Amino acid sequence: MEKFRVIGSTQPLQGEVTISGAKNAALPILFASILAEEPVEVANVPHLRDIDTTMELLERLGAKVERNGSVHVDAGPINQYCAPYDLVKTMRASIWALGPLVARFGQGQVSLPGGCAIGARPVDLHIHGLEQLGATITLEDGYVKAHVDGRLQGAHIVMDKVSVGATITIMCAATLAEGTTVLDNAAREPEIVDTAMFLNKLGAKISGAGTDSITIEGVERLGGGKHAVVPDRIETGTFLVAAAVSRGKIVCRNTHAHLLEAVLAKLEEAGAEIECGEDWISLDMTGRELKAVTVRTAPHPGFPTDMQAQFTLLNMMAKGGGVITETIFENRFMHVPELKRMGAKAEIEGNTVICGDVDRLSGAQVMATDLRASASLVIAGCIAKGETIVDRIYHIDRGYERIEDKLSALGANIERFR
Amino acid sequence: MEKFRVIGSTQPLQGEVTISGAKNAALPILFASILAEEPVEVANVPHLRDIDTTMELLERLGAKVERNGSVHVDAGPINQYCAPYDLVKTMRASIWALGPLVARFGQGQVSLPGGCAIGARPVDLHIHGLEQLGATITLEDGYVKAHVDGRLQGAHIVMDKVSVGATITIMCAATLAEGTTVLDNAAREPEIVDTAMFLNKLGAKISGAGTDSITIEGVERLGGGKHAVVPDRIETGTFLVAAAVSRGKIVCRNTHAHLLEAVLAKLEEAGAEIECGEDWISLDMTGRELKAVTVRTAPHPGFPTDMQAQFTLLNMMAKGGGVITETIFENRFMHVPELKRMGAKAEIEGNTVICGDVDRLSGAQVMATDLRASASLVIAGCIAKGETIVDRIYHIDRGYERIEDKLSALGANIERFR
Amino acid sequence: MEKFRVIGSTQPLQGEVTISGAKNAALPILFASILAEEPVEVANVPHLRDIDTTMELLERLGAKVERNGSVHVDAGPINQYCAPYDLVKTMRASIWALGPLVARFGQGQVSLPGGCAIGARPVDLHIHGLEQLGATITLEDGYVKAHVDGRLQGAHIVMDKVSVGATITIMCAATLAEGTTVLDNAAREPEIVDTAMFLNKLGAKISGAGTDSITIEGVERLGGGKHAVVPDRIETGTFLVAAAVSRGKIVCRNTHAHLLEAVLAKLEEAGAEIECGEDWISLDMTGRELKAVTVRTAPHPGFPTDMQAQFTLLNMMAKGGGVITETIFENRFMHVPELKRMGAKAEIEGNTVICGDVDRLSGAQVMATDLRASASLVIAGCIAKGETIVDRIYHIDRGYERIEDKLSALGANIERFRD
Amino acid sequence: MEKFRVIGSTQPLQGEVTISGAKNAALPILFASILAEEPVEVANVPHLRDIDTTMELLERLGAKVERNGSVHVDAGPINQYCAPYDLVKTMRASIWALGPLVARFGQGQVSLPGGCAIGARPVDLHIHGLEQLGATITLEDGYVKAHVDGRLQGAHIVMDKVSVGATITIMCAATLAEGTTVLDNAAREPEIVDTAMFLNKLGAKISGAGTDSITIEGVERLGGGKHAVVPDRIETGTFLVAAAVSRGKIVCRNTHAHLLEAVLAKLEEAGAEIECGEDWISLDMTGRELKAVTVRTAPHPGFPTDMQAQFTLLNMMAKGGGVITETIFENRFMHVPELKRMGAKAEIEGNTVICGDVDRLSGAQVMATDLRASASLVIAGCIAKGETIVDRIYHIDRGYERIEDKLSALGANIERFR
Ligand SMILES: CC(=O)N[C@H]1[C@@H](OP(=O)(O)OP(=O)(O)OC[C@H]2O[C@@H](n3ccc(=O)[nH]c3=O)[C@H](O)[C@@H]2O)O[C@H](CO)[C@@H](O)[C@@H]1O
Ligand SMILES: CC(=O)N[C@H]1[C@@H](OP(=O)(O)OP(=O)(O)OC[C@H]2O[C@@H](n3ccc(=O)[nH]c3=O)[C@H](O)[C@@H]2O)O[C@H](CO)[C@@H](O)[C@@H]1O
Ligand SMILES: CC(=O)N[C@H]1[C@@H](OP(=O)(O)OP(=O)(O)OC[C@H]2O[C@@H](n3ccc(=O)[nH]c3=O)[C@H](O)[C@@H]2O)O[C@H](CO)[C@@H](O)[C@@H]1O
Ligand SMILES: CC(=O)N[C@H]1[C@@H](OP(=O)(O)OP(=O)(O)OC[C@H]2O[C@@H](n3ccc(=O)[nH]c3=O)[C@H](O)[C@@H]2O)O[C@H](CO)[C@@H](O)[C@@H]1O
Ligand SMILES: *[C@H](C)[C@H](O)P(=O)(O)O
Ligand SMILES: *[C@H](C)[C@H](O)P(=O)(O)O
Ligand SMILES: *[C@H](C)[C@H](O)P(=O)(O)O
Ligand SMILES: *[C@H](C)[C@H](O)P(=O)(O)O
Ligand code: NA
Ligand code: NA
Ligand code: NA
Ligand code: NA
Ligand code: NA
């Protein structure tokens, strides 16, 4: 198991960082490419483990896949329709293959994702969504087995809850259904907007993406095309926090303020000065005193739960307390007892963390548990005093491309080892 | 203390009900008219106590007010700026007086509302939204005291949580600020749309209302005009549920399905046949079995917390159990133990009620506690066996207009008495 | 509708206060006397609205009832078996009438309590506990109708949750059942112990009260007798909070520390010097810095939920934050938005209050919603700057005896008034 | 990693099983023996990973240790005082080393445990209680470092909350203090009672163990002795559920009903025939109808949280719903989504699972995440239709001795493989 050895410092993290394509846009785009009958190019895809898994999954369906900067996909010759346990237990996102498969081939099988470290994370909304589009779905031997005689049919659908994943499953499958689909109470996340933009280039007709009502007019087939994935707003916030919490000064390139206004306002409120350009965001925390903030996770454009662990660390270092309420997932405070091992002060109650204030963390051996928690611990390591060992660092590589290099270019002292 | 004596019946409720203007659009529109220098007419306003309290409150500022079908307001000669405790303790919506006063006159005092039966209901967002428009705000003798030297200044504001009230405060006040305001993560409720249509008729420049990003270009003054208040989606919901739970058959006039797509979909799922027209909605339940649903309250267009009490009842009488989860207010199951007095089966756990199934309620003396719970008890009274006395019915009059007359036309047996 | 006009001061509250008998012991014991075939005298009973309500409820069953220092009760000639809606809507402890009546007479009807301000407060455990003693129970037109053909039958009962009320129902009712009952996971509140002491004087055979396992050996009947009610630990805590929060000095007479060790340790943790005698407790906070504390309400001997609102105020005036977590009742933070009107700082999330720090509160008009919140507002009145009007003050009289007079003896400026 | 291959059947699980000594007794007793200057012998100790790890902990302090039926410990020559990271990350109960060490040697160091999967599990109450006995405690490099100049000082302590672990820590440490200690609001779990019996045989002076006030009079030193560990009530509960959920008939030996009255009563309420002897409990579910039940977890003698996963399975197979509220640990529902893979039906909200009804589960591949979930998954494997693979089965050996053997003796078809 790979680990990070991090040697901390009161040195501010400063410099520049090039922000990669969004993990959470590139995934649903690549799964959406199953619908396409012609070759497809997806530019600005980061190198992550979840993309290798996704790439392998498409290969195992009969698609031809190749990558470096872009990923090229020829989904034309797809002639298998299963996403097996072996891969799904690796990556629950695999659920996204069920919609495109049934919609294009009338058939689809996908291992039901078991339990996630951050929550039970059921998929009822995906299932009920495709059923509403005319599919028949069962569970046999732990596989969600879906099928429809003919084409899926357009329907008016109102989501019980706001769900990113399910909004996508339904929107994507609806592109090849007969007639028109109106999905109400959809999620507004910008990766949804990007997945629609991509599909529309292939010959789909999706309108209202990024509003709570999405209209999809079904077409008989989708073609080919090129698309550059939207920048990663979470990677972006992650580095801004890294600068904020170290009295630092950083500019993020190839990223856009409109993707993360809630985070940018919270960072301004915690003391930072923020500037924005055509395609960059800068943060200056030099000579500014870090102040605690109150936070409530919520659907976009509210505060994203993917920034929650990073702001737990911020508040732990910020004077004036700091309270974080997590509404989205039920078990996403696993970073707290780890940070406590480094001398951090906080208390948990239901869905809320109440942070104390601490001048400086102490290096210690800690263990990553999930993707965003993992990053917070590495940042903690950078500012702490002495040597930090972050075990199980493969979690980071699921969502950050070569984070040790990116942070090293900012003055961090990080070693990847076995 | 007025009461309702209801004699229940197995007879399904049938007929027509004419839906009134939305209470929650009428109110902010009325408070918004404080910004107007010229006479205003607000049509399609229901007769509720809360609208009387709002009228009394404008009178006390120096406005000229009168009504019957419409409400007529001349806020030109206003020369006092305090909303006093004796009225605010009656109706917390009075905080809406603060923003217009300070925006137009540079000054405002409103009594800080105390505890609500359904929740703590703080107004921290209203105060902090106004502070970002450049107002200086104190609390003194229980009065939220706001002031600004000159005009408020437009700003970029990102809401910390979704709030209907706070969104309104900020939008209305920004219509007279110098420069442009952008309000992100605003509430999307349809009463916000209405208020904004109203304000634009007076010379305001508000775009994006009904989306999560509201842009307001400030103007130096607003003039006069005439506006008709959007129909009440909650009152619509309430009668649709009455029909459904008595296995009956109704049509609601002067309403629009697009105001309540979440409610209509749960009524369909529960078994009801629903048709919609240009300005009407019907529900037919005759010879259809009532089926339990799970519901989760959320901000519009999700399932409204103002429909939750009524849907508790529906589940209590429906087969298959039913689960209602309330995310918005922390204490809105006060109806449950009073319904249990009538023989209902339910268990509360945290923010969730788990309903059993019951064939028919039994009449009993019960007590209304809040507006929406009140109507649930009344509906319950109509289907129960024997006589139900609902104490403290003045709550119903705050939000429904002569509901004993509307239900009477549908065949209910209801007496108002002391 | 009565109010208090409180005028605040920085002068610490100082002096003595004589603790009355526990309301929450007085009540079960009076409902318990329904079992008694002959005269009973209950000493050390406070003068409260809830006791007046209990005495009328007893009268309406056919008991003969008088009071002043004590309450005298002859339950011998009881001839009716209904607790009517008009009384239960007033006081939900009226549910305790169900078990004695069914146990002694084979029958009892009691109106099913509605919603309470502080939580839904179902009574399913009382009912189920009585069903398991052999009773048949139905809900008919809002009334809990219980009957049994003959005497109740002892049973081994394991409580699904800890409930003060239900433990008492089952305990009392069991004293006239045939054979032996063992109640497990029983509440251990001292008011249960005192009710058990009371019943045993009348010829009952209750053992293990105050532990999690209570054995009741049923008897055929119960005599009469005399009992002085245990001190009120909540009133005790409430005055000790008053001294502490006013940076003052107090001694409470006719009370015992062993009733509230959890409150005392938190008061010491808040920075107070506390001393105890055989029947008194003193607190001195003079020259001392009030420090915030974290609290988790929990069954006795844990931190009592009835002290929560008062400790909410304590933490709001204390430095260092302060976190209060309520695990018992679901909606018991109504005092918070009212204290906010007086300038307090706190935020609520779920079952937890996170308190800020404030040097001095500010007088304002405020509304009592419940008994314990009522007292916290009064105490806040005493230390705030200026005048405070506490509306709907009748709540306080449900559980405190002439509280304005007790506070006035300490230095407070309080006026009960109308209109 | 070892796995179980289970092949399910409708065959009822029937026969006998011998209950071992309680895991949760044997551990605190073996940590308690750090106090003793003379050899100690602890009989009826189960063969479990956690007991190997404890024996290793003890040796590393310099104690002499053998086992098989019993564990022998000679703590006399202890010359070291650290519980290192490499052991604590394996088993957080190593915290119980801290108290005995500082009590006996004036010094102790223990790695601050990180996150547990079932909750954050802080240890604040152990620290604050040892400080109240006169210890000075610090956090340094992730180690809890305790020390006192001389002997500990008996104190009057009220626990902020009920904690099994801290109760024991404070109780054990107090046996060597100068003077008397009174631990109010103490935990009452029978494993505390057992530990105190063990200590009094060595010369300690503990009384009240079993109630909420424990009085310990300090002595100078403690000698040696023999003690048979109390039967495991959770292992007992677990086999009783296995029979109940299989329409089965079982008798458990070397166990006592008074250890688990809460569980027996819910089993009876579920429709099972229970009978109890001097040292046995039997359950007969043959030809009986399994009925759902409600459970609220709570401190002993309430319903134990270590039975909650098993009772989740039970209610999932029982008719009439089933609600389970967990009030002790904040993330103890990880079995749920894994059972869903097997066709189980249930939803979760906050601290509560709302169970549906299923006639028979479907074999699938599933993942154990903790001790009690692990066992519930194996039992589900025995009653499901088809083949079930439970991965990461080492979890189960942390607390159940040779469970595949105990279950085969009841009819089951289980295979341990790699
Ligand atoms: C795009 C991606 O690869 N993963 C992201 C995606 O996860 P994901 O799409 O799983 O997140 P969702 O918005 O679907 O889920 C949010 C909440 O809704 C619940 N829910 C969801 C579906 C369902 O059928 N039933 C149900 O109850 C989930 O358990 C969770 O409690 O959005 C999350 C919300 O920002 C991000 O944190 C994840 O990083
Ligand atoms: C229009 C009107 O007269 N009343 C409606 C309005 O109330 P209202 O405008 O009060 O509702 P909000 O959306 O503002 O409140 C929603 C949640 O946000 C919280 N919050 C609100 C303001 C604030 O400054 N801080 C804060 O934390 C509230 O306590 C609540 O828990 O919207 C509610 C939600 O649809 C409706 O049920 C009410 O019937
Ligand atoms: C007259 C009297 O002595 N009143 C006290 C008594 O009230 P009371 O006896 O009502 O309080 P309980 O101990 O019964 O209630 C504890 C918890 O159990 C729940 N519950 C209770 C009974 C039941 O049948 N089902 C059920 O679910 C309640 O809703 C509550 O959440 O104890 C409370 C808790 O210490 C004190 O605050 C009250 O001042
Ligand atoms: C080795 C052992 O005997 N383990 C058992 C023991 O664990 P353990 O002794 O760790 O359990 P505790 O009773 O201490 O913990 C109960 C609750 O208190 C909290 N807490 C605990 C200690 C502390 O210092 N601060 C704090 O907040 C925990 O988060 C938990 O939510 O009791 C549990 C409760 O039945 C059982 O499930 C475990 O199997
Ligand atoms: C953990 C985050 C989930 O189970 P995965 O499928 O995304 O790994
Ligand atoms: C209850 C709904 C609130 O407290 P009000 O101010 O509207 O009376
Ligand atoms: C409120 C405290 C309850 O409903 P009561 O019966 O004591 O008035
Ligand atoms: C999980 C059960 C805890 O971390 P452990 O230390 O007992 O493994
Ligand atoms: Na902080
Ligand atoms: Na139902
Ligand atoms: Na404080
Ligand atoms: Na609540
Ligand atoms: Na079930």
XYZ file of C-alpha atoms in Angstrom, chain B residues 32-320:
289
model
C -42.579 45.181 -0.888
C -45.057 47.945 -1.636
C -43.367 49.965 1.100
C -40.854 50.744 -1.669
C -43.551 52.312 -3.857
C -44.025 56.105 -4.021
C -47.341 55.864 -5.762
C -50.598 54.025 -5.179
C -50.668 50.304 -5.762
C -53.466 47.780 -6.274
C -52.918 44.134 -5.395
C -55.748 41.941 -6.690
C -56.748 38.346 -5.968
C -55.809 38.658 -2.256
C -57.467 36.236 0.104
C -59.176 37.312 3.361
C -56.822 36.134 6.092
C -55.873 37.457 9.503
C -52.242 37.692 8.417
C -53.214 40.114 5.705
C -55.135 42.186 8.278
C -51.994 42.257 10.474
C -49.937 43.338 7.480
C -52.449 46.144 6.793
C -52.318 47.289 10.416
C -48.582 47.263 10.191
C -48.442 49.438 7.088
C -50.908 51.829 8.685
C -48.525 52.245 11.588
C -45.762 53.403 9.218
C -48.027 56.114 7.813
C -49.325 54.306 4.749
C -52.859 54.565 3.485
C -54.540 51.167 3.165
C -57.974 49.734 2.277
C -59.298 46.495 0.726
C -61.746 43.990 -0.355
C -61.169 41.841 -3.488
C -57.913 43.699 -3.949
C -55.749 45.535 -1.489
C -54.963 49.213 -2.196
C -51.782 50.699 -0.849
C -50.305 54.183 -0.912
C -46.911 54.002 0.737
C -45.954 57.512 -0.428
C -46.643 59.384 2.851
C -44.887 56.901 5.107
C -43.043 58.661 7.950
C -42.561 56.111 10.705
C -40.159 53.190 10.515
C -40.829 50.800 13.423
C -42.637 47.439 13.235
C -43.579 47.029 16.899
C -43.481 43.906 19.141
C -47.245 43.833 19.649
C -47.683 42.989 15.912
C -44.487 41.122 15.233
C -45.304 38.609 18.022
C -48.455 37.904 16.006
C -46.771 37.434 12.645
C -43.080 36.882 12.089
C -43.420 37.756 8.366
C -43.102 41.287 9.649
C -39.287 41.014 9.128
C -40.046 41.730 5.521
C -40.674 45.323 6.650
C -36.998 45.836 7.416
C -35.434 45.722 3.971
C -37.801 48.129 2.198
C -37.672 50.609 5.006
C -33.937 50.803 5.121
C -33.668 50.705 1.321
C -36.100 53.610 0.833
C -35.670 55.694 3.986
C -32.211 54.756 5.200
C -33.710 53.483 8.450
C -35.726 50.587 9.946
C -36.589 48.971 13.273
C -38.255 45.626 13.461
C -38.924 43.507 16.588
C -36.769 40.366 16.406
C -39.219 37.447 16.151
C -39.117 34.906 18.950
C -39.889 31.206 19.005
C -42.285 29.660 16.525
C -44.240 26.545 17.340
C -42.655 24.762 14.328
C -39.071 25.892 14.899
C -36.505 28.459 16.095
C -36.790 30.312 12.806
C -33.854 32.748 13.095
C -33.445 35.640 10.663
C -29.621 35.808 10.600
C -29.703 35.589 6.836
C -31.990 38.575 6.486
C -29.644 40.647 8.653
C -26.435 39.481 6.924
C -27.959 39.980 3.479
C -28.744 43.555 4.352
C -25.274 44.084 5.806
C -23.768 43.103 2.457
C -26.009 45.752 0.804
C -24.175 48.061 3.147
C -26.523 48.461 6.111
C -25.377 48.773 9.682
C -27.475 46.593 11.917
C -27.822 46.369 15.716
C -30.105 44.639 18.189
C -31.502 46.858 20.994
C -34.493 46.396 23.366
C -35.355 43.308 21.231
C -35.489 45.470 18.043
C -33.449 44.703 14.996
C -32.286 48.265 14.222
C -31.031 48.850 10.661
C -29.686 52.036 9.111
C -27.672 53.277 6.171
C -26.296 56.722 5.413
C -27.592 57.298 1.860
C -28.433 54.391 -0.469
C -27.637 50.728 -0.163
C -24.931 49.449 -2.518
C -25.297 46.571 -4.902
C -23.181 43.550 -4.192
C -22.522 39.996 -5.136
C -24.208 37.869 -2.465
C -24.126 34.108 -2.083
C -26.704 32.756 0.289
C -25.362 30.430 2.981
C -28.558 28.398 2.889
C -31.702 28.403 0.768
C -34.243 30.748 2.404
C -37.484 32.051 0.935
C -37.846 34.922 3.352
C -34.231 36.011 3.159
C -34.177 35.829 -0.641
C -37.144 38.175 -0.652
C -35.624 40.632 1.784
C -32.474 40.922 -0.241
C -34.122 41.125 -3.636
C -36.703 43.757 -2.623
C -34.156 46.014 -0.883
C -31.693 45.693 -3.813
C -34.232 47.175 -6.177
C -33.322 50.613 -4.720
C -29.564 50.145 -4.167
C -26.913 51.963 -6.251
C -25.595 49.565 -8.890
C -26.091 45.889 -9.551
C -26.798 43.066 -7.138
C -26.358 39.397 -7.976
C -28.001 36.995 -5.531
C -26.765 33.412 -5.868
C -28.301 30.296 -4.460
C -31.566 32.147 -4.102
C -34.790 30.373 -3.254
C -36.785 29.380 -6.350
C -40.297 29.367 -4.789
C -43.022 30.747 -7.170
C -43.986 33.447 -4.674
C -40.496 34.896 -5.318
C -41.274 35.026 -9.038
C -44.543 36.816 -8.289
C -43.094 39.438 -6.003
C -40.490 40.162 -8.634
C -43.048 40.495 -11.453
C -44.903 42.889 -9.161
C -41.823 44.961 -8.410
C -40.792 45.195 -12.072
C -44.239 46.654 -12.815
C -43.263 49.546 -10.552
C -40.035 50.215 -12.415
C -37.680 47.654 -10.932
C -35.161 45.626 -12.984
C -35.099 42.081 -11.716
C -34.045 39.180 -13.853
C -33.498 35.509 -12.937
C -36.281 35.185 -10.390
C -37.317 31.562 -10.299
C -33.684 30.512 -10.884
C -30.917 30.310 -8.324
C -29.251 33.476 -9.595
C -31.213 36.708 -9.268
C -29.891 39.887 -10.815
C -31.232 43.230 -9.704
C -30.152 46.529 -11.320
C -31.031 49.155 -8.693
C -33.161 52.207 -9.558
C -33.596 55.525 -7.709
C -37.392 55.217 -7.261
C -40.373 52.940 -7.943
C -43.815 54.152 -9.135
C -47.359 52.717 -9.069
C -49.217 49.842 -10.701
C -51.610 46.913 -10.559
C -50.778 43.187 -10.009
C -52.847 40.018 -9.522
C -51.423 37.562 -6.953
C -50.538 34.067 -8.133
C -52.903 31.262 -6.917
C -52.143 29.356 -3.664
C -50.413 26.037 -4.398
C -50.680 24.974 -0.767
C -54.426 25.603 -0.508
C -54.716 23.771 -3.863
C -52.748 20.872 -2.388
C -54.900 20.880 0.729
C -58.198 20.328 -1.088
C -56.666 17.853 -3.473
C -55.666 15.846 -0.422
C -59.126 16.181 1.128
C -60.597 14.642 -1.995
C -58.026 11.919 -1.995
C -58.343 10.886 1.557
C -62.153 10.713 1.454
C -61.953 8.673 -1.784
C -63.726 11.570 -3.542
C -63.694 13.727 -6.657
C -62.799 17.355 -7.000
C -61.765 20.088 -9.431
C -59.821 23.225 -8.298
C -60.405 26.404 -10.280
C -57.908 29.217 -10.815
C -54.738 27.269 -10.262
C -51.864 25.838 -12.309
C -50.215 22.440 -12.088
C -46.718 23.895 -12.641
C -46.937 25.372 -9.143
C -47.074 21.887 -7.534
C -45.665 19.176 -9.740
C -44.106 17.439 -6.706
C -47.476 17.161 -4.930
C -49.356 16.032 -8.005
C -46.843 13.264 -8.670
C -47.178 11.943 -5.085
C -50.976 12.067 -5.374
C -50.748 10.036 -8.586
C -48.412 7.546 -6.920
C -50.863 7.231 -4.051
C -53.531 6.213 -6.591
C -55.266 9.317 -7.771
C -56.261 10.235 -11.234
C -55.254 13.786 -12.035
C -55.978 15.998 -15.043
C -54.782 19.552 -15.635
C -56.058 22.343 -17.863
C -55.132 25.929 -18.583
C -56.173 27.137 -15.157
C -57.640 24.169 -13.335
C -56.653 20.889 -11.722
C -58.925 17.897 -11.046
C -58.498 14.870 -8.799
C -60.653 11.726 -9.027
C -60.214 8.969 -6.429
C -63.517 7.156 -6.667
C -63.064 3.402 -6.746
C -59.280 3.752 -6.413
C -57.335 2.394 -3.412
C -55.284 4.792 -1.341
C -51.579 3.774 -1.323
C -48.851 4.942 1.055
C -45.946 7.041 -0.222
C -42.610 8.109 1.114
C -42.121 11.869 1.074
C -39.115 14.130 1.727
C -39.594 17.869 2.242
C -37.318 20.185 0.272
C -37.180 23.656 -1.212
C -39.218 24.272 -4.361
C -39.716 22.531 -6.793
C -39.237 19.696 -4.305
C -42.014 18.548 -1.992
C -43.134 21.557 0.123
C -42.975 21.465 3.918
C -46.321 23.355 3.861
C -47.927 20.165 2.511
C -46.368 17.835 5.031
C -49.049 17.742 7.710
C -51.704 17.016 5.157
C -49.595 14.241 3.611
C -49.028 12.747 7.018
C -52.778 12.249 7.230
C -52.946 10.803 3.770
C -50.341 8.213 4.699
C -52.015 7.482 8.014
C -55.124 6.370 6.103
C -53.260 4.747 3.210
C -52.268 1.091 2.935
C -48.554 0.152 2.914
